[PDB]
Amino acid sequence: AAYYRPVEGLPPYKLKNTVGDYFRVTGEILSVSGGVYFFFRGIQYFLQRRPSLKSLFVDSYSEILFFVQSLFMLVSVVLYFSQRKEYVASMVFSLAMGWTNMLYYTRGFQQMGIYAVMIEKMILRDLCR
Amino acid sequence: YYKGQTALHIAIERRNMTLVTLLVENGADVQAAANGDFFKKTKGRPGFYFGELPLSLAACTNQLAIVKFLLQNSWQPADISARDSVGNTVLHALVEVADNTVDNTKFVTSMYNEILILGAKLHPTLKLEEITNRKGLTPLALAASSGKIGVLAYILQREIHEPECRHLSRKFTEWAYGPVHSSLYDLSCIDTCEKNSVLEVIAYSSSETPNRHDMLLVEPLNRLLQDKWDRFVKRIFYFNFFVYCLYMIIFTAAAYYRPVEGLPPYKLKNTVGDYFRVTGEILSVSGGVYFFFRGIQYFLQRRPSLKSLFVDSYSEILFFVQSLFMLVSVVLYFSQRKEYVASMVFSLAMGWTNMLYYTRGFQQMGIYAVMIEKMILRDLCRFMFVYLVFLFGFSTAVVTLIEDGSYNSLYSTCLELFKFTIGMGDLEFTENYDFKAVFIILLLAYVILTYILLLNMLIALMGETVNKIAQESKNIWKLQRAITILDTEKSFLKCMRKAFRSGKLLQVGFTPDGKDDYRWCFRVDEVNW
Amino acid sequence: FMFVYLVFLFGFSTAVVTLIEDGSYNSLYSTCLELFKFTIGMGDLEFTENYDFKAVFIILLLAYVILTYILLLNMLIALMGETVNKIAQESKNIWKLQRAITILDTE
Ligand SMILES: CCCCCCCCCCCCC(=O)O[C@@H](COC(=O)CCC)COP(=O)(O)O[C@H]1[C@H](O)[C@@H](O)[C@@H](O)[C@@H](O)[C@@H]1O
Ligand SMILES: CCCCCCCCCCCCC(=O)O[C@@H](COC(=O)CCC)COP(=O)(O)O[C@H]1[C@H](O)[C@@H](O)[C@@H](O)[C@@H](O)[C@@H]1O
């Protein structure tokens, strides 16, 4: 849906009598639905735990990252309807994080999960130094 | 169900010697058909994998009194050679129960020696140790195939220094000169047992045997493999390496000087170069066919499963795949196509790469190549997923961020972001495009995540893996040399028997019958005090 | 090392040079050079244009880069690390011997 976005100015953009626009808008709707789902999952996670700052940013990274992805997607929706071009700038960030968040699923696979958690720990303990 | 669980079985099982003695004296039979589904193998489910014979229970429970008591029954004598549903005897039972631990090895070794010597004394005419089960395995071959390294280590070098018992020994010390001792090993059924020798079963296992790497380190087998290496296999292997190198050179020369016209085939002329070229092509295709049939012969003589095919025998697969590519090239060459070049070059690249197969037989090079193979298989399946996730995510992000009425394609952007791995990234490969700050942020985030963090983590993890495979590489190289030796002697291309060790040497000169014995003893010199 | 590396370099050099030909990078020396450059961080990935079987050419180069640049050159570092960790004392012994030889010759 993102890669085939239109290249005109000042969204939103209307559907035509072709078939491509229907596939594109279908993809956009499914994408935004996914973003909303992850938004509410993040809220449900927070409410059922209520961790503090000293526990929130040292644990539960994956939930934070998925929530952040959904935030970017929603900001993109707001800008898309708000007659702005910058909806692109938010959307791509979400897209990038979305693909990166694929690594969350390496858990459940022994070797891949050990590899991915080692990478996460060598990111947190490293860049700050 | 617990079919055949007679009172004697329970008395032995509960370690109640009083009940066992009373039941045996009362006339309880030994040949119990303890064939209940509980008493069968497949111990993963609830069951008892070494039943179907009370002698098997008596020996497997480490109680010498019961087995010594059943030698001379009051009513019905026991028979050590009694066989269960799958042909296993007491000795096979003693092999199967082992778990390769020091204490268990001590108990199983003790019971094995005692039961074997008692059976020999009771029936000197019967060679209990040579009896095979339904699969055609002796207890030695069973221990080797199944993975019972401890029992194998015992059996291959057991000895008894007593009159009328030394003839059962494997190891001897016939001569000594002060500190020097000239040990002998009979080593029957190691070089050949006419169906399945110890080396054959260890080397050609299904890869599930836990100790196939460690079994070849034992005292007699390592020396045998070294002797066969030094004797004749070294020369044949180096000769094969030389011939293969010449084959690859001819193939490369044929490929490089291919014609540059369209729509093959192309006819010979009255010049001289065309004859050399077509000669090289014919030799190349002949080599491809040879490797094709070698691959098939390897498959048919093994029939491994998918879970064993793609975790073992990589070299045979690679040589076969080379053959497939060359044959596809031949088909396209005659089919009036240009695409034969593609398959030919893939074959050529794989042939030169497969040149590394021959580093076995050279100590340091072979260890090096084994480490490379293991650190390819273990590392790419872990690394490339992570790397491709990052590359694809940022490629799609950048390519969908930039667009005009040149880098509008995901392929080109994937390439330009790949270049950052090989030290040729630009950091500026577009201009006047919208959202310049976002573009720069994305590229810098990609560079930090991939170039600065991920590749260095790859190096560090490869360091750890290297530290943890110093020994597995040595064992695997020894195993590869073992495979080479066994294959070379098995084929040998002349139908000659050169695998013999020392001839029919008069090791013992004694049997229970009034006869001598020749046992193909192999000599080993050692020095100690 | 150089045996393994030269096997890879020569195999892929011959593959690429026999894949491309016309009536500039069509010689074995130049192609061996251009594939050597990938070790020192100056590979192009696109050093020929309009040549037949573009997909095969790209597959070959990418396979070469992965096999050599990303796996082999890093493995060299890892193995050197192991050997360096394991020759720390042998180095001291050999240096003492070298000084002993120097002393004996001078005396
Ligand atoms: C603009 C473009 C930006 C792209 C940014 C990309 C960031 C890197 C992406 C990293 C991908 C992996 C991932 O996203 O998942 C990782 C989190 O990696 C990070 O730390 C990112 C730091 C930043 C695991 O997440 P998790 O929530 O499982 O953490 C575990 C807890 O669950 C558990 O209770 C335990 O406490 C355990 O010790 C915890 O680890
Ligand atoms: C288009 C261009 C593509 C070029 C592709 C090139 C691939 C890399 C080339 C690798 C060169 C080395 C080689 O080809 O030989 C290696 C195999 O390397 C690989 O794994 C390649 C993975 C892929 C050893 O082969 P081998 O059959 O001896 O395996 C041993 C068994 O014999 C033994 O029983 C034991 O199980 C032991 O643990 C096993 O190791």
mmCIF file of C-alpha atoms in Angstrom, chain A:
data_model
loop_
_atom_site.group_PDB
_atom_site.id
_atom_site.type_symbol
_atom_site.label_atom_id
_atom_site.label_comp_id
_atom_site.label_asym_id
_atom_site.label_seq_id
_atom_site.Cartn_x
_atom_site.Cartn_y
_atom_site.Cartn_z
ATOM 1 C CA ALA A 1 0.000 0.000 0.000
ATOM 2 C CA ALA A 2 2.780 2.432 0.852
ATOM 3 C CA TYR A 3 4.986 1.824 -2.181
ATOM 4 C CA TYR A 4 2.118 2.421 -4.640
ATOM 5 C CA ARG A 5 0.911 5.584 -2.917
ATOM 6 C CA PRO A 6 -0.225 8.401 -5.230
ATOM 7 C CA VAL A 7 2.124 11.197 -6.262
ATOM 8 C CA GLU A 8 -0.311 14.134 -6.407
ATOM 9 C CA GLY A 9 -0.499 16.988 -3.898
ATOM 10 C CA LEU A 10 -2.853 17.783 -1.026
ATOM 11 C CA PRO A 11 -4.537 14.500 0.053
ATOM 12 C CA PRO A 12 -7.065 12.858 0.265
ATOM 13 C CA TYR A 13 -7.332 11.440 -3.253
ATOM 14 C CA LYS A 14 -10.493 10.054 -4.805
ATOM 15 C CA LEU A 15 -11.121 6.602 -6.214
ATOM 16 C CA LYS A 16 -11.554 6.077 -9.952
ATOM 17 C CA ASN A 17 -13.272 3.484 -12.145
ATOM 18 C CA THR A 18 -10.101 1.368 -12.352
ATOM 19 C CA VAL A 19 -9.288 -1.643 -10.159
ATOM 20 C CA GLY A 20 -5.886 -0.577 -8.865
ATOM 21 C CA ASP A 21 -7.354 2.141 -6.662
ATOM 22 C CA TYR A 22 -9.628 -0.392 -4.980
ATOM 23 C CA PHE A 23 -6.701 -2.678 -4.166
ATOM 24 C CA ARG A 24 -4.701 0.296 -2.895
ATOM 25 C CA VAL A 25 -7.442 1.656 -0.648
ATOM 26 C CA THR A 26 -8.136 -1.875 0.597
ATOM 27 C CA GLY A 27 -4.497 -2.176 1.587
ATOM 28 C CA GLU A 28 -4.598 1.208 3.294
ATOM 29 C CA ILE A 29 -7.701 0.254 5.266
ATOM 30 C CA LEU A 30 -6.203 -3.062 6.368
ATOM 31 C CA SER A 31 -2.977 -1.290 7.327
ATOM 32 C CA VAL A 32 -4.753 1.343 9.418
ATOM 33 C CA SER A 33 -6.878 -1.350 11.034
ATOM 34 C CA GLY A 34 -3.703 -3.131 12.060
ATOM 35 C CA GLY A 35 -2.317 0.097 13.446
ATOM 36 C CA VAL A 36 -5.434 0.641 15.533
ATOM 37 C CA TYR A 37 -5.297 -2.939 16.804
ATOM 38 C CA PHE A 38 -1.738 -2.480 18.007
ATOM 39 C CA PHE A 39 -2.677 0.873 19.556
ATOM 40 C CA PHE A 40 -5.354 -0.731 21.694
ATOM 41 C CA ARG A 41 -3.091 -3.674 22.519
ATOM 42 C CA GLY A 42 -0.527 -1.225 23.852
ATOM 43 C CA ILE A 43 -3.119 0.520 25.997
ATOM 44 C CA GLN A 44 -4.445 -2.794 27.308
ATOM 45 C CA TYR A 45 -0.910 -3.838 28.189
ATOM 46 C CA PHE A 46 -0.278 -0.616 30.087
ATOM 47 C CA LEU A 47 -3.529 -0.607 32.054
ATOM 48 C CA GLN A 48 -3.202 -4.221 33.177
ATOM 49 C CA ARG A 49 0.328 -3.579 34.533
ATOM 50 C CA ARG A 50 0.779 0.127 35.440
ATOM 51 C CA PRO A 51 4.596 -0.056 35.647
ATOM 52 C CA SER A 52 6.659 2.904 36.786
ATOM 53 C CA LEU A 53 9.261 4.830 34.806
ATOM 54 C CA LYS A 54 12.064 2.865 36.468
ATOM 55 C CA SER A 55 10.352 -0.327 35.233
ATOM 56 C CA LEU A 56 8.705 0.916 32.031
ATOM 57 C CA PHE A 57 11.838 1.919 30.082
ATOM 58 C CA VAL A 58 13.996 -0.953 31.377
ATOM 59 C CA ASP A 59 11.456 -3.670 30.478
ATOM 60 C CA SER A 60 8.668 -4.371 27.990
ATOM 61 C CA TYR A 61 10.522 -2.966 25.032
ATOM 62 C CA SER A 62 8.556 -4.836 22.450
ATOM 63 C CA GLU A 63 5.215 -3.494 23.657
ATOM 64 C CA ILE A 64 6.616 0.040 23.621
ATOM 65 C CA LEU A 65 7.926 -0.404 20.088
ATOM 66 C CA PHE A 66 4.651 -1.804 18.769
ATOM 67 C CA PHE A 67 2.766 1.018 20.457
ATOM 68 C CA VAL A 68 5.136 3.559 18.913
ATOM 69 C CA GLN A 69 4.543 2.007 15.491
ATOM 70 C CA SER A 70 0.815 2.408 15.917
ATOM 71 C CA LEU A 71 1.269 6.009 17.047
ATOM 72 C CA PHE A 72 3.168 6.818 13.871
ATOM 73 C CA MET A 73 0.490 5.156 11.760
ATOM 74 C CA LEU A 74 -2.267 7.152 13.457
ATOM 75 C CA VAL A 75 -0.380 10.430 13.045
ATOM 76 C CA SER A 76 -0.067 9.518 9.379
ATOM 77 C CA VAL A 77 -3.833 9.032 9.153
ATOM 78 C CA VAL A 78 -4.424 12.403 10.810
ATOM 79 C CA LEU A 79 -2.128 14.146 8.358
ATOM 80 C CA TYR A 80 -3.622 12.268 5.400
ATOM 81 C CA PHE A 81 -7.068 13.616 6.185
ATOM 82 C CA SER A 82 -5.638 16.978 7.319
ATOM 83 C CA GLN A 83 -4.601 17.922 3.753
ATOM 84 C CA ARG A 84 -0.853 17.586 4.302
ATOM 85 C CA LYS A 85 1.973 15.902 2.436
ATOM 86 C CA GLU A 86 3.867 15.078 5.638
ATOM 87 C CA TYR A 87 1.697 12.000 6.132
ATOM 88 C CA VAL A 88 4.383 10.345 4.023
ATOM 89 C CA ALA A 89 7.070 11.242 6.548
ATOM 90 C CA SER A 90 5.237 9.618 9.425
ATOM 91 C CA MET A 91 4.079 6.603 7.415
ATOM 92 C CA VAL A 92 7.533 5.482 6.328
ATOM 93 C CA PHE A 93 8.790 5.614 9.890
ATOM 94 C CA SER A 94 6.042 3.248 10.908
ATOM 95 C CA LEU A 95 6.854 1.050 7.931
ATOM 96 C CA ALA A 96 10.510 0.921 8.924
ATOM 97 C CA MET A 97 9.677 0.086 12.523
ATOM 98 C CA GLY A 98 7.129 -2.436 11.357
ATOM 99 C CA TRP A 99 9.696 -4.440 9.461
ATOM 100 C CA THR A 100 12.182 -4.134 12.275
ATOM 101 C CA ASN A 101 9.582 -5.316 14.743
ATOM 102 C CA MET A 102 9.482 -8.571 12.807
ATOM 103 C CA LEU A 103 12.420 -9.568 15.014
ATOM 104 C CA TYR A 104 9.993 -9.740 17.946
ATOM 105 C CA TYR A 105 8.797 -13.047 16.565
ATOM 106 C CA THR A 106 12.224 -14.708 16.746
ATOM 107 C CA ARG A 107 11.182 -15.835 20.207
ATOM 108 C CA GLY A 108 9.792 -19.337 19.944
ATOM 109 C CA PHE A 109 12.713 -20.315 17.702
ATOM 110 C CA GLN A 110 15.643 -21.413 19.868
ATOM 111 C CA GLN A 111 18.666 -20.266 17.887
ATOM 112 C CA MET A 112 17.047 -17.214 16.307
ATOM 113 C CA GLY A 113 15.685 -16.058 19.657
ATOM 114 C CA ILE A 114 19.032 -16.347 21.419
ATOM 115 C CA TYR A 115 20.626 -14.464 18.532
ATOM 116 C CA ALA A 116 18.053 -11.674 18.597
ATOM 117 C CA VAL A 117 18.139 -11.152 22.349
ATOM 118 C CA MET A 118 21.934 -11.014 22.252
ATOM 119 C CA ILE A 119 21.660 -8.305 19.609
ATOM 120 C CA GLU A 120 19.163 -6.362 21.714
ATOM 121 C CA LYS A 121 21.406 -6.503 24.776
ATOM 122 C CA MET A 122 24.456 -5.462 22.730
ATOM 123 C CA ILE A 123 22.434 -2.480 21.490
ATOM 124 C CA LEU A 124 21.326 -1.245 24.897
ATOM 125 C CA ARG A 125 24.648 -1.761 26.677
ATOM 126 C CA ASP A 126 26.704 -0.418 23.745
ATOM 127 C CA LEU A 127 25.405 2.769 22.148
ATOM 128 C CA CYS A 128 25.047 4.592 25.470
ATOM 129 C CA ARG A 129 28.790 3.937 25.897
#
